Each structure stands twice: as structure tokens, then as C-alpha cells.
């Protein structure tokens, strides 16, 4: 039929990076002018595969992966960077054939009042293997000193972005979409 890229991109609530979502894209035809020259993309980099030669190629599947991090935290979605967005939330693998996209969404995902919907795990037990997730908010004890004996020590794993229309770019929401590649999704002009 037709491939649903815009139905990941233009959706009106995204997830957080703690509980990011995936939409399998399968048995369809996928267009890439819409991805080449959309010029709102403040970071758009493709590893191992050329964005201007994605039109002329086949893949077994496309997996869209989408969340909101803050605008400082966007470069953590690279092969082989660390920090909590890479370490504990969305670890890209080193052998990632794909694209990482972001765009500024201060106009749509940041209120004066305080948008606290979008979240990030800053604290985890071990580091995260690639393409894995921890949705659980089981409250994070300091590695062995357990939590729920009577509120002794567990620093809760999730913290959350307070996003504002009146910050600078470090604390501004970026919707970040990753389109990982992997022969039922191919292009036009192909």
C-alpha cells in the first residue's frame, strides 16, 4: 500500500525517551524527498547509507523510533556516545544503518506554564544494551541498599524535563525520530 512516515512525524503527542515507541513500517513504498528537503530538521544525519541515495534502494524493513529529548540532549543519539540518554534510555548500536532526525518543537511542545509531560531516566542499575527499553518506574535503590524499606534510599529513576517557551536552546523540546534500516520497503525512482 503506502508507507506511514508522516503518521510518526506529524503526530500531536510524542512519547518520552524512557518509554519511547516503535511503529513497524512494512509491505509498502517509502518516499524520501519529504525527508531530504524538509529544512526544519536541525539535526539530520544518516550513518552508512546516503539520504540522497535512499530513493534508489531496498530494505527488508524500516523501523521508526520516536521520543522527545531536550535540545542539548539530541547529539546523544549517535553511534557510541554516552550519558544517560545514550546509557539508560536510547542506546543506538555501533553498527546502525539508519538515520537520526530531530527538529525544533519549542513552538508545539513548550508552554509558558511548564510542560512536564516529557521525561528521562537519569538513574539506572546497569547500562542499557542497544534497542532495549525499561518502561518500569520501579524506584531506583542505590544499587544494593534497597528502596521500599521504609523510604531509606531510592532516588526515583525518572526525572522530567520542565520545558519552557522562555528558555534558550539547551532546555527546549526536540522531537527526535530515528528511522533504522534492515525486501518489502523500497523507494520511487528505484
Amino acid at each position: 500500500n503506502l508507507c506511514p512516515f508522516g503518521e510518526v512525524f506529524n503526530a500531536t503527542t510524542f512519547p518520552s525517551v524512557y518509554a519511547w515507541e516503535r511503529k513497524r513500517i512494512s509491505n509498502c513504498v517509502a518516499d524520501y524527498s519529504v525527508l531530504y528537503n524538509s529544512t526544519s530538521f536541525s539535526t539530520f544525519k544518516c550513518y552508512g547509507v546516503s539520504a540522497t541515495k535512499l530513493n534508489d534502494l531496498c530494505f527488508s524493513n524500516v523501523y521508526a523510533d520516536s521520543f522527545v529529548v531536550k535540545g542539548d540532549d539530541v547529539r546523544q543519539i549517535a553511534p557510541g556516545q554516552t550519558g544517560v540518554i545514550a546509557d539508560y534510555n536510547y542506546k543506538l548500536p555501533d553498527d546502525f544503518t539508519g538515520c537520526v532526525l530531530a527538529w525544533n518543537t519549542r513552538n508545539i511542545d513548550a508552554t509558558q506554564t511548564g510542560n512536564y509531560n516529557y521525561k528521562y531516566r537519569s538513574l539506572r542499575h546497569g547500562k542499557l544494551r542497544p534497542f532495549e527499553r525499561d518502561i518500569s518506574n520501579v524506584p531506583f535503590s542505590p544499587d544494593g541498599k534497597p528502596c521500599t524499606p521504609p523510604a531509606f534510599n531510592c532516588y526515583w529513576p525518572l526525572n522530567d524535563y520542565g520545558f519552557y517557551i522562555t528558555n534558550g536552546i539547551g532546555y527546549q523540546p526536540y522531537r527526535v525520530v530515528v528511522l533504522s534500516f534492515e525486501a518489502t520497503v523500497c523507494g520511487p525512482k528505484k
Epitope: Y36, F44, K45, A51, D94
Partner: antibody
Framework: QLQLQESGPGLVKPSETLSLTCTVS??????????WGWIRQPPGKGLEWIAS???????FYNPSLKSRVAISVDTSKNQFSLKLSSVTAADTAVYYC??????????????????????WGQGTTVTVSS | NFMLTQPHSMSESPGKTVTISCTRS????????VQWYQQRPGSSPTTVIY?????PSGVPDRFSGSIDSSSNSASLTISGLKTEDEADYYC?????????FGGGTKLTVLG
Amino acid sequence: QLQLQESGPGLVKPSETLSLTCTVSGGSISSSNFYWGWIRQPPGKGLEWIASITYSGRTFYNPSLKSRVAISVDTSKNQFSLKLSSVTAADTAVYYCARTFPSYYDRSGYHYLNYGMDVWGQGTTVTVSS
Amino acid sequence: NFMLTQPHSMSESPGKTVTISCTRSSGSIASNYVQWYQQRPGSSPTTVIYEDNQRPSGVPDRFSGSIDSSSNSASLTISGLKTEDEADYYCQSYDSSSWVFGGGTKLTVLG
């Protein structure tokens, strides 16, 4: 937690061949986005890029060293390795095996590759003396 | 190919900002990306700016990079400079032959 470790001879005798080997720990050497190469620093002077390779086999050298450098990958032992032949006494340096930032094709398909080092190594001191 | 001419030594008292102006000789500056490495003595280098201005994880917030294209130059800028940062600093860029490192800026804080 990718960590780079240099294993080196200490002495290379003058106008012989330096036998260097970098042991890679926390990633695959067969990883196409990453370039892997060496940086030296002769003591009290500044830094200098030598060569870099990936396991495409594609290699960029410093052309003021390209006559004397061969850099090679041994994937079953996870390592990449440096030959520096025809050594002068002013090739005394501390050699840093290093991973690059991952190679991407950008908005307009311009392929940025092998461009700055990322994870550094510990160094091993190569001394040229008779 | 080109050269990258750093100042060899800089000083600035604790707190108030410093700037290391690495000048590229021939070929314009922001054609290629600039990376800055901190080397402390007896130590490995560590990358602190990459792709002209971006910070790795663990690098403090005050470490800002920029490009100064009027004198064809490239700037590492550290506000709030604590006595941690007494270190060498090296710009590095490249063209269609090889990579050119900078000469080292020996930052020291005097108070």
C-alpha cells in the same frame, strides 16, 4: 565504555620498523561507521595524525608519512595495528590509538568521515634510540 | 593543506572567561569541522568540543566552542574557569590531504 589500549615495543632501533598494536575493548572493530587510527605526540612538541582505517579497508594517511606507514586490521583478535618503517630519531613519540566520531551522510548526502578522535587510548611510549 | 596557529600560552584569573583563538592559514574555516582536545600533563587527551561547538558527556557546561570566520578563526571558550582546567588545548581540522592539529595552547590560571 569502549576503551582503547596500546600494546607497544618501547624501543624501535633506528631505521627499522615500529611494531604497534591497539587492543579494542567495548565495541566491534568491524563497525563501519567508526574509523580507527593513530595520533602521536613527540615529547614537548604537539599532536599529529598518522593514518586511519576502518574494516572497509579504506585508508587515509598523512601524506608526509604515507611512504612509511602501513596500518592493518586483525578482526579475530579485535585489534588494529601500525607499521611505521624507516624510522628517524625524531619519530620518538607517545602513540595514541583512537576511535573517530561515527561517519554519516548528512542532509545533502555529503559523507563526513574520519574527522576527529573520540575515545582516546592510554598511550605507549615509543623511544627511538641506538 | 594548511596550518592551525594557536597562541602558545594563555592566562586568565579564576572565574572570568578565556578564549583560545585557533587560526587556519589558507582555506576557509568552517568548510570542515573543528574538534578540541584537552590534554592535562602526564595524561591522555580527551575530546571536549566536536563538530565546531558540540559537547560530549562529562564535559562541563561552560566549555563552549564557536567559529570566528572574520579572521578565519576557531574559538574554544571556557567561562567559570576553575583550577581543574590547567591543561594543553589543541584545535584540529582537516582538508583533502590530511588532518592538521593545532600547536597547543597552555592554559594556566594565575590566582
